[PDB]
Amino acid sequence: VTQSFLPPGWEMRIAPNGRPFFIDHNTKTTTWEDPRLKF
């Protein structure tokens, strides 16, 4: 039941076209690439 965390200031949403996307509030930017693939 352990959750997988994004780094601080990041959140995931689902776009209307069905793709997940990621908001980086630290830089006020968005990306299709999940940071967790990049740890």
Swiss-Prot record:
<comment type="subunit">
    <text>Interacts with UBE2E3. Interacts with NDFIP1; this interaction activates the E3 ubiquitin-protein ligase. Interacts with NDFIP2; this interaction activates the E3 ubiquitin-protein ligase. Interacts (via WW domains) with SCN1A. Interacts (via WW domains) with SCN2A. Interacts (via WW domains) with SCN3A. Interacts (via WW domains) with SCN5A. Interacts (via WW domains) with SCN8A. Interacts (via WW domains) with SCN9A. Interacts (via WW domains) with SCN10A. Interacts (via WW domains) with CLCN5. Interacts with SMAD2. Interacts with SMAD3. Interacts with SMAD6. Interacts with SMAD7.</text>
</comment>
<feature type="domain" description="WW 3">
    <location>
        <begin position="4"/>
        <end position="37"/>
    </location>
</feature>
<comment type="subunit">
    <text>(Microbial infection) Interacts with Epstein-Barr virus LMP2A.</text>
</comment>
<protein>
    <recommendedName>
        <fullName>E3 ubiquitin-protein ligase NEDD4-like</fullName>
    </recommendedName>
</protein>
<comment type="function">
    <text>E3 ubiquitin-protein ligase that mediates the polyubiquitination of lysine and cysteine residues on target proteins and is thereby implicated in the regulation of various signaling pathways including autophagy, innate immunity or DNA repair. Inhibits TGF-beta signaling by triggering SMAD2 and TGFBR1 ubiquitination and proteasome-dependent degradation. Downregulates autophagy and cell growth by ubiquitinating and reducing cellular ULK1 or ASCT2 levels.</text>
</comment>
